[PDB]
Design a protein around this ligand. Sequence first.
Ligand SMILES: C[C@@H]1O[C@@H](O)[C@@H](O)[C@H](O)[C@@H]1O
Ligand SMILES: C[C@@H]1O[C@@H](O)[C@@H](O)[C@H](O)[C@@H]1O
Lengths: 108, 108
Amino acid sequence: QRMGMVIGIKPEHIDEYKRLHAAVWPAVLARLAEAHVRNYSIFLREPENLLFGYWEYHGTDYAADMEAIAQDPETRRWWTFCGPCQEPLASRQPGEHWAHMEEVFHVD
Amino acid sequence: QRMGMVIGIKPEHIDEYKRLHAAVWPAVLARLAEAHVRNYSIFLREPENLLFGYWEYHGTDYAADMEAIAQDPETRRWWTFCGPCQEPLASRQPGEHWAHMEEVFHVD
Ligand SMILES: C[C@@H]1O[C@@H](O)[C@@H](O)[C@H](O)[C@@H]1O
Ligand SMILES: C[C@@H]1O[C@@H](O)[C@@H](O)[C@H](O)[C@@H]1O
């Protein structure tokens, strides 16, 4: 199961966001691996100031594993650093931070 | 070597683009596999009307393998169908159709 997601970034915080992601906290990464998230990349587009996340989810209840992460206190502290850098899409659903995208094509 | 890329889509052509990609021409996929492109997905975001492509490139000279594809006669015919659906970013470099993104994070 593949997922693509999208969020805005504030241009004045792009360097800070890159610095943070050069050394993502081990507790954050372990909590992501425990929720069955693998092969996870984030891409940046300037000048449109968009972040594209891609990951492969090997779990069996996505909505639960995501709420697991959402309450990990170390991940919530990490989000106090990343969040201010980001600009959630005005068009997202209630409850979304990153906005989900629809897969329209895959080839192995 | 992971790569992320982005292009616009015209909302009036979204259904046609999805239909085309439900059965991508076998010659197009063969030329992509022979250029060492693997694990290739395309995601769509409405309402921002953005397409996000992700692939993993196991080749040795990216700029050459991309040029090989760009001259394949069957791929150029295929692009006469996809292209009219797309809206290349006004901000892209000369020579780009899809605009490349910068990887800022990966975890396995
Ligand atoms: C490791 C990643 O770091 C930031 O980019 C967050 O927005 C993501 O939710 C994730 O925690
Ligand atoms: C298979 C893919 O199909 C369309 O989306 C094109 O824009 C891509 O370049 C690629 O050929």
